[PDB]
Amino acid sequence: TTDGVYRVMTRSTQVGVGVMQEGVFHTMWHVTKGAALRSGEGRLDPYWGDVKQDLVSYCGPWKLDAAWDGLSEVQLLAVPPGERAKNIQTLPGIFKTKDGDIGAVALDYPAGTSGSPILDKCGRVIGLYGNGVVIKNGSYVSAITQGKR
């Protein structure tokens, strides 16, 4: 369970990505649907999740608490299926909802990139990529989805 970004695989097909931080694995709910994960020879069990937020954590409570500052550029640490991890910098747009604004990134990657972390300039994870909308021209915009620690 060493800190870092991980591919989530099924046996192989990459179904998503997640973040190991402080001994807790963080991904989007739709990647695993809460199923147990193998890590080397050990089993990771779900601890917390929320379908509406589309998030799940393993081995402990959600640890990622950094927030987009509403102003600065961010980086998607994209881990696409079959491709090495790479950083893409972007200035977020905004999802305007009845319950407030959410930062959003207009970056379009394969479904198995779900769970890739979005970073601020200090390298902190301000959310996970992969719950979003399809706009009129067919391209994709992802919320910056963050949980509550």
């Binding site: 800190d3 870092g4 970004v5 991980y6 591919r7 989530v8 695989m9 099924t10 046996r11 179904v15 990505v17 931080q21 694995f25 709910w29 739709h30 695993t32 199923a35 147990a36 994960l37 193998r38 890590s39 990771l44 929320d50 379908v51 509406k52 937020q53 589309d54 550029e73 980086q75 640490l77 881990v79 090495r84 991890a85 950083n87 893409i88 910098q89 972007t90 200035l91 747009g93 905004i94 999802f95 305007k96 909802t97 319950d99 959003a104 990134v105 207009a106 970056l107 972390p117 970073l119 601020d120 300039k121 200090c122 390298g123 994870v125 979003g132 909308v133 706009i135 915009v141 919320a143």
Partner: protein, 40 residues
């Protein structure tokens, strides 16, 4: 149905990264199943 994880990298900001994408401002709704839709 073996679901497993494998490390893919370190989490860091990369200096002088490629910058791309626009900054759309969209009216959206979030339903109880966690699905976002456009408000049209």
């Amino acid at each position: 149905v073996d679901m497993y994880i494998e490390r893919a990298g370190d989490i860091t900001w990369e200096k002088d990264a490629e910058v791309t994408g626009n900054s759309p401002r969209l009216d959206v709704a979030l339903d109880e199943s966690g699905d976002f839709s456009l408000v049209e």
